[PDB]
Amino acid sequence: NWLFGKKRKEDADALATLKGQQNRLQAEARNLERQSDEQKILASKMLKAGNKAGARQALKRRAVFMKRLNTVHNTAMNLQAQIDSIQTATSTAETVKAMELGTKVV
Amino acid sequence: NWLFGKKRKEDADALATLKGQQNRLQAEARNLERQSDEQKILASKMLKAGNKAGARQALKRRAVFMKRLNTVHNTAMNLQAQIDSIQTATSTAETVKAMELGTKVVGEKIKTVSPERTERVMDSVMEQRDQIEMMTEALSDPSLSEGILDFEDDAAIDEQLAQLE
Amino acid sequence: AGARQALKRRAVFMKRLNTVHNTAMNLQAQIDSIQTATSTAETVKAMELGTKVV
C-alpha cells in the first residue's frame, strides 16, 4: 500500500543525490577546462614575449589541470553508469513482474 | 543533526586560516619583488654613475632578496596544495556517500527481483509455449479432416487433369 | 581518436537498442501466447459441444 510510494520516493531521492553530485563534478570539470584554455593562451602569449622556462612551467600547469580534468570526467562517467544501473534495475523488475502476470494468466 | 553544521564550520575556519596565512605570504613575496626591482634599477643607476664593487654588493642584495622570494613562493604553493587537499577530500567523501546510496537502492531492487526469479519466469514462459503448441497442433492436424480419401486416385486425378487439358 | 570514442558510444547505444528490442519481442510473444490460449480454449469448448450433440 503506502510502502510503494515510499520506495518511489527513495529511488527518486537517490537519483537526485547522484545527479546533484554529477552536477558538482561537471562544474569542476568546466572550471578546469576554463583554466586550461586560459593557460594555453597565456603560454602562447608569453612565448610571443620571449620566455621558455616559464613556458615549461606553463605547460606543467596545463598538464596538471588536464590530469585533474580527466579524473573528474571519469568520476562523472562512473556516476552516470550508476544512475543507468538504477534505471535499468527498475525497468527490469517491472518487466519481470509483467511477464509473471502473463504466465499466471496462461 | 547539529554536528554537521559544526563540521562545516570547522572546515570553513581551517580554510580561512590557511587562506589568511597564504595572504601574508603573498604580501611578503610582493614586498620582496618590489625591493628586488628597486635594487636592480639602483644597481643600473650607480653603474651609470661608475662603481662596480658597490655593484657586487647590489647584486648580492638582489640575490638574497630573490632567494627569500623563492622560499616564500614555495611556502605559499605548499599552502595552496593543502587547501586543494581539503577541498578534494570533501568532494571525494560526498561522492562516495552518493555512490553508497545508489548501491543501497540497487541492492534492494535486486533483492526484490533476483536472477533466480527471472530464470524461473522464463522457464514457465517456455513450458507454457510448449503446451500451447501441443494444444494448437492437436486441433489443426489435416489427417483428421483434409485427408478423407487416401486412395491411389493420384493416377485418376492425373487422368482428369489430362481430360481438362 | 574522438571518432573512436564516437563509434564506441554508437556501439554501446546499438547494443542497448538490440537488448530492448529483444525484450519487446519476448513481451509480444507472451501476448500472442495469451491470445492463442484463449482462442484454443474456446475452440475446444465448441468441439466438445458438437461432440455431445452428435
Author numbering:
A (entry chain A): 4 to 109
B (entry chain A): 4 to 168
C (entry chain A): 56 to 109
Source paper text:
To aid these processes, cells from across the tree of life use a conserved family of polymer-forming endosomal sorting complex required for transport III (ESCRT-III) proteins that deform, cut, and repair membranes (1–3). Individual ESCRT-III proteins are small and have a simple set of α helices (α1 to α5) that define the functional core of the protein. The most stripped-down version of the ESCRT-III system is found in Asgard archaea, the closest prokaryotic relatives of eukaryotes, which have as few as two ESCRT-III homologs. We show that Asgard ESCRT-IIIB assembles into parallel arrays on planar membranes to initiate membrane deformation, from where it recruits ESCRT-IIIA to generate composite polymers.
However, after mixing the protein with large unilamellar vesicles (LUVs) containing 40 mol % of the negatively charged lipid 1,2-dioleoyl-sn-glycero-3-phospho-l-serine (DOPS), long filaments were observed by cryo-EM. These filaments have a diameter of ~12 nm and are reminiscent of those formed by eukaryotic B-type ESCRT-III proteins. Filaments were also seen decorating and occasionally interacting with LUVs of various shapes, further suggesting that polymer nucleation is aided by the presence of membranes under these conditions. The polymers are composed of four protofilaments (blue, pink, green, and orange). (C) Top view of a cross section through the filament, highlighting the two protofilament pairs and the interprotofilament interactions through α1 and α4. A comparison with our off-membrane structure revealed a slightly smaller intersubunit distance in the membrane-bound protofilament (~3 nm versus 2.7 nm, respectively). This was accompanied by a change in the angle between helices α3 and α4 (off-membrane: 145°; on-membrane: 116°). Although the precise nature of Asgard cell membranes has yet to be determined, our data reveal a requirement for a critical concentration of ESCRT-IIIB protein to initiate polymer formation on reconstituted membranes. This likely reflects the need to form a stable five-subunit nucleus involving i to i + 4 interactions, which then extends by fast polymerization, as is the case for other cytoskeletal elements like actin.
